[PDB]
Design an enzyme around this catalytic site. Structure first.
Site, PDB file in Angstrom:
ATOM      1  N   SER A  42     -53.934   5.389  -0.422  1.00 27.94           N
ATOM      2  CA  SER A  42     -54.053   5.950   0.925  1.00 27.94           C
ATOM      3  C   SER A  42     -53.094   5.303   1.930  1.00 27.94           C
ATOM      4  CB  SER A  42     -55.425   5.690   1.498  1.00 27.94           C
ATOM      5  OG  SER A  42     -56.465   6.239   0.725  1.00 27.94           O
ATOM      6  N   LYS A  45     -49.735   6.519   3.552  1.00 25.77           N
ATOM      7  CA  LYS A  45     -49.638   7.503   4.631  1.00 25.77           C
ATOM      8  C   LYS A  45     -49.013   6.947   5.892  1.00 25.77           C
ATOM      9  CE  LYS A  45     -53.647   9.941   2.660  1.00 25.77           C
ATOM     10  NZ  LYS A  45     -55.086  10.272   2.932  1.00 25.77           N
ATOM     11  N   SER A 103     -57.449   9.921   7.398  1.00 23.81           N
ATOM     12  CA  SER A 103     -57.005   9.873   6.013  1.00 23.81           C
ATOM     13  C   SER A 103     -57.226  11.182   5.291  1.00 23.81           C
ATOM     14  CB  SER A 103     -57.646   8.702   5.242  1.00 23.81           C
ATOM     15  OG  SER A 103     -56.717   8.133   4.298  1.00 23.81           O
ATOM     16  N   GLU A 139     -51.776  13.601  -3.477  1.00 22.48           N
ATOM     17  CA  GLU A 139     -53.247  13.524  -3.512  1.00 22.48           C
ATOM     18  C   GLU A 139     -53.854  14.669  -4.325  1.00 22.48           C
ATOM     19  OE1 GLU A 139     -55.038  11.217  -2.418  1.00 22.48           O
ATOM     20  OE2 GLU A 139     -53.934  10.245  -0.778  1.00 22.48           O
TER      21      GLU A 139
HETATM   22  C1  LIG Z   1     -56.723   7.610   0.636  1.00 14.89           C
HETATM   23  O1  LIG Z   1     -55.934   8.346   1.201  1.00 14.89           O
HETATM   24  C2  LIG Z   1     -58.045   8.069   0.106  1.00 14.89           C
HETATM   25  C3  LIG Z   1     -57.742   9.189  -0.853  1.00 14.89           C
HETATM   26  C4  LIG Z   1     -57.137   8.595  -2.137  1.00 14.89           C
HETATM   27  O2  LIG Z   1     -58.948   9.843  -1.113  1.00 14.89           O
HETATM   28  C5  LIG Z   1     -58.890   8.439   1.334  1.00 14.89           C
HETATM   29  C6  LIG Z   1     -60.411   8.560   1.106  1.00 14.89           C
HETATM   30  C7  LIG Z   1     -60.933   8.063   2.505  1.00 14.89           C
HETATM   31  S1  LIG Z   1     -62.492   7.191   2.125  1.00 14.89           S
HETATM   32  C8  LIG Z   1     -63.820   8.351   2.632  1.00 14.89           C
HETATM   33  C9  LIG Z   1     -63.731   9.656   1.826  1.00 14.89           C
HETATM   34  N1  LIG Z   1     -64.615   9.595   0.626  1.00 14.89           N
HETATM   35  C10 LIG Z   1     -64.386  10.184  -0.598  1.00 14.89           C
HETATM   36  N2  LIG Z   1     -63.298  10.882  -0.975  1.00 14.89           N
HETATM   37  C11 LIG Z   1     -59.902   7.170   2.902  1.00 14.89           C
HETATM   38  C12 LIG Z   1     -59.969   6.346   3.982  1.00 14.89           C
HETATM   39  O3  LIG Z   1     -60.947   6.450   4.739  1.00 14.89           O
HETATM   40  O4  LIG Z   1     -59.140   5.416   4.190  1.00 14.89           O
HETATM   41  N3  LIG Z   1     -58.745   7.389   2.286  1.00 14.89           N
HETATM   42 CL   LIG Z   2     -54.555   2.215  -0.227  1.00 19.78          CL
END
Ligand SMILES: *C(=O)[C@H]([C@@H](C)O)[C@H]1C[C@@H](SCC/N=C\N)C(C(=O)O)=N1
Ligand SMILES: [Cl-]
Ligand SMILES: [Cl-]
Length: 261
Positions: A42, A45, A103, A139
């Site tokens: 994540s 980004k 995110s 993603e």
């Molecule tokens: C990063 O971009 C994560 C991608 C890989 O799913 C994303 C998920 C959210 S956590 C809360 C969502 N729950 C389940 N999918 C996140 C973040 O809050 O940093 N990044």
């Molecule tokens: Cl990360």
């Protein structure tokens, strides 16, 4: 010392922790597993948003440009994209804000398409002098042992972010926009900034990844005006989510013992 304190945290939480605290100019102040790879599922980004802003800076993009997409393009975690999809598009600005502050995965995918895909983001990392960070897939595919795809190091990310936030690759305009967006992040209230005094200006990008991954990279400015970047990557598969965030806040409380308050 810092390395013994983080080790104690690993052992107590049955976790792997990687962390780098760097100066305004990217220089390492303290770290622990700072050159080991972790999945960047994540936090990519943040540099992605900066690439998009830099395209805007160069006249190759503008903020109001419509990024068209339909329901097939949605991902499972895409709160903003799901609201806008009936309209057919998100603007560059909306996608940057959503990918950073929520995110949102589909918004991030829109921005990836905009810049030319994972390879062009990897080229961006390289252009900024980050020789290690790499994005390879989109993603949610990007989220086995020995696979270096979609990885960074705590040091590489901290250094990269320090250059984007505090250095001169973005214009004053874009750099301000990126900072204000990170300050307004909605997903980091319990992570790094929960371990820092509330008087300090802080902006961050979090991540939650496979194998109990819970990561955060933040910039901050202390009341003495001293500017820093802190990256924290964690894998704590036996902790619950609230505990994983508390583990990141604990790491920040340790790292702040080394900054000018
Ligand atoms: C990063 O971009 C994560 C991608 C890989 O799913 C994303 C998920 C959210 S956590 C809360 C969502 N729950 C389940 N999918 C996140 C973040 O809050 O940093 N990044
Ligand atoms: Cl990360
Ligand atoms: Cl410095």
């Amino acid at each position: 010392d810092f390395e013994h304190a983080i080790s104690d945290l690993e052992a107590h939480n049955q976790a792997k922790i990687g962390v780098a605290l760097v100066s305004e100019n990217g220089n390492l102040i303290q770290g622990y597993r700072a050159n080991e790879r972790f999945a960047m599922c994540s936090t990519f980004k943040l540099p992605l948003a900066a690439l998009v802003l830099s395209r805007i800076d160069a006249g190759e993009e503008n903020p109001e440009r419509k990024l068209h997409y339909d329901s097939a393009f949605l991902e499972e975690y895409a709160p903003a994209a799901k609201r806008y999809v009936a309209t057919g598009y998100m603007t560059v600005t909306e996608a940057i804000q959503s990918a950073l502050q929520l995110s949102d995965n589909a918004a991030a995918n829109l921005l990836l398409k905009e810049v030319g895909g994972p390879p062009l983001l990897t080229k961006y990392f390289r252009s900024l002098g980050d020789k290690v960070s790499r994005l390879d897939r989109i993603e949610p595919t990007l989220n086995t042992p020995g696979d270096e795809r979609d990885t960074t190091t705590p040091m590489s990310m901290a250094q990269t972010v320090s250059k984007l936030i505090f250095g001169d690759t973005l214009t004053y305009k874009s750099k301000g926009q990126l900072r204000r967006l990170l300050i307004g992040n909605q997903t980091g209230d319990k992570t790094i900034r929960a371990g820092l005094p509330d008087s300090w200006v802080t902006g961050d990008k979090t991540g939650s990844c496979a194998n109990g991954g819970r990561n955060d990279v933040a910039f901050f400015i202390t009341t003495a005006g001293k500017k820093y970047v802190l990256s924290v990557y964690t894998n704590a598969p036996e902790l619950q989510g609230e505990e994983r965030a508390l583990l990141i806040a604990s790491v920040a409380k340790l790292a702040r013992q080394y900054v000018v308050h």
